Amino acid sequence: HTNLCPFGEVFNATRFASVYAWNRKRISNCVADYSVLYNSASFSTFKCYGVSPTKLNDLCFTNVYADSFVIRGDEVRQIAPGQTGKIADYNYKLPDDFTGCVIAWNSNNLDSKVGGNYNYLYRLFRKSNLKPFERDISTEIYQAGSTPCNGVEGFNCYFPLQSYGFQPTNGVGYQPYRVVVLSFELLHAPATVCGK
Amino acid sequence: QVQLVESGGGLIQPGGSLRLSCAASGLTVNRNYMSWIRQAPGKGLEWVSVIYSGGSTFYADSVKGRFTISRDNSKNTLSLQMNSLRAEDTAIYYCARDFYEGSFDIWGQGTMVTVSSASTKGPSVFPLAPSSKTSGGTAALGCLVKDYFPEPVTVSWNSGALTSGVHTFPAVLQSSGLYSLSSVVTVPSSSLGTQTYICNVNHKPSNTKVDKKVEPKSC
Amino acid sequence: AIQLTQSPSFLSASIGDRVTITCRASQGISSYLAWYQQKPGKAPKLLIYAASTLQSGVPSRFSGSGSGTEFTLTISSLQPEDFASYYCQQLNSYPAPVFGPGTKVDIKRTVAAPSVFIFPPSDEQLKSGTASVVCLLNNFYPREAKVQWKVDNALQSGNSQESVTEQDSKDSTYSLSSTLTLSKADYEKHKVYACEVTHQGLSSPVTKSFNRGEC
Ligand SMILES: *[C@@H]1O[C@H](CO[C@@H]2O[C@@H](C)[C@@H](O)[C@@H](O)[C@@H]2O)[C@@H](O[C@@H]2O[C@H](CO)[C@@H](O)[C@H](O)[C@H]2NC(C)=O)[C@H](O)[C@H]1NC(C)=O
Ligand SMILES: [Cl-]
């Protein structure tokens, strides 16, 4: 393989998904230049688990997945193995045995708008925790008591999603961060993604 | 009929344990963000712990490793196990439901938790004698109710026949760990020679009842 | 972490007044704010959430506004049941909820200077080894008042505690006690015991005093 992996499409994407509806790009049959990502001085977070970040260009994997979404600054710590909280429990969950890297950068200049950017959403209500790499896009009214809701937002009956409302004057912890999660999968199948 | 009802509070020594419970009706505990919040005497609110519908729990830094929040789905209750208690854990403890990012719409009435090494003790009652110095005006006298534990005490004057002009102050907690308060009343100076003034002090925890006659002091 | 300030700490108002309370956040928190009411001996009551949404069952005279760092709670026409304390809360906060220090709204009345009284320790208490000296500030308004103990003209600090009543239901005044505690030996090392009171109703500070052992 001589074609480069389309990591540009993921990291430089025009728009990013809401975390509850996180995007997944399946990357295969390509050569990846991972040192380009790690040599970049433009990332706030670059944490890898089960792989050393530098000595990564001479590894081959069956599939590489690139998940991407926007969360709060204060919530980036939840995109890690073994974490709990609103985002890890109800929006995007990494497995305990995660093999991959978590990459984040402040996107206040792109994803906040004056008076509030209500495009980006997170799930506030869910009965049970997500399994690793589970994506829940349902919009059913959340039942917090014994009586059914049937589509109306009232007492004990909550719309499950809420808006971040990113305003450019937000404190850093409330500012938007774009996140890319690279997971590396090694199955008993031909390895389609190698580095060079 | 939506309500939360706390229970299990009480008096305990430092290092002891208490378990609070919170019975819910009108909402399902295991489907909600349920929190304990406490309020020390004369202070503001402090969040203590939360349990998520999905099961995650979180704690204030000041209680981490000592308190444990839990819930019982069959009884629709919430609980707080408090170990290694300290004097500064003394507070009213509320359970509350969080319906938007910390917005607590349903609150219980609260249960009082008092952590202290003080021995139960009835108060001494000392006179605040009317000053010997305004002719034809108003005089102040009272009773100092000193060194008791625990709260509360009650004070009356002349067995209830004197109510006008009485001020019974909130107790203060002294550095000894014992409480003290005073009760005062203003009366006509003309009456000091003729009307007897007696404060009636009741401290039920020690079975103490004291009547103290308050007179002008003589030389 | 972010810190919340509230202004003013105390506010006097009459029935029918327009009342506005302010909450400041040290960094931008968008509309992540809630407002509560609390009265003595009762749990807090949610008034506003998301900075401006009126909680159901709350009278429409309550409104909140602001976004970012500056937030206000407004009572368009103050009603008798609105005399209370009010607190703001930072929502969706990391790591823990943060509450503002509060605003107490009490009942406005005409200025009334306190009547001041000083009480020496009783002979009965003295025989036990401790002397409590009590200064009483009676039926004053507004609540703000300063008590300065003086012992042989040395200004005392660190050895007194004060207590204040709730606003009187009939005349809307406050009363306050200050108690100076000394050992008997210390009490007997000095002669002149005085409390000096400062208050808006007094053109200059009022001092009440006694000399130890002089009736
Ligand atoms: C994501 O894009 C950056 C920047 O892209 C630059 O601007 C674009 C409009 C397009 O014209 C790119 O070709 C530009 O390079 C990439 O980082 C750049 O790398 C080049 C060298 O390859 C360098 O000259 C630029 O200065 C870099 N830009 C910055 C801001 O440092 C980056 O590699 C892309 N991400 C991925 C995963 O490919
Ligand atoms: Cl539901």
Residue numbers in the entry:
A (entry chain E): 332 to 527
B (entry chain H): 1 to 133, 135 to 220
C (entry chain L): 1 to 215
Authors' description from the paper:
However, one class of public antibodies have attracted particular attention, those using IGHV3-53 (Dejnirattisai et al., 2021; Yuan et al., 2020; Wu et al., 2020). For these and the IGHV3-66 antibodies, the mode of binding is dictated by the HC CDR1 and CDR2, which orientates the antibody such that the light-chain CDR1 region lies atop residue 501. However, there is a correlation between the LC for the IGHV3-53 antibodies and the magnitude of the effect; thus, the common IGLV1-9 antibodies (mAbs 150 and 158) show a consistent reduction in affinity of roughly 3-fold. However, a survey of the various structures determined shows that IGHV3-53 frequently pairs with IGLV3-20 and often results in 501 contacts. mAb 269, which is also a VH3-53 mAb, paired with the IGLV1-9 light chain, however, appears hyper-sensitive to the mutation (30-fold effect). The structure of Fab 269 in complex with WT RBD determined at 1.8 Å resolution (STAR Methods) shows similar interactions to those observed for mAbs 150 and 158. In most cases, the mAbs showing reduced neutralization with B.1.1.7 are compatible with structural predictions, but in the case of mAb 269 crystal structures of the wild-type and B.1.1.7 RBD complexes provided an explanation of this sensitivity.
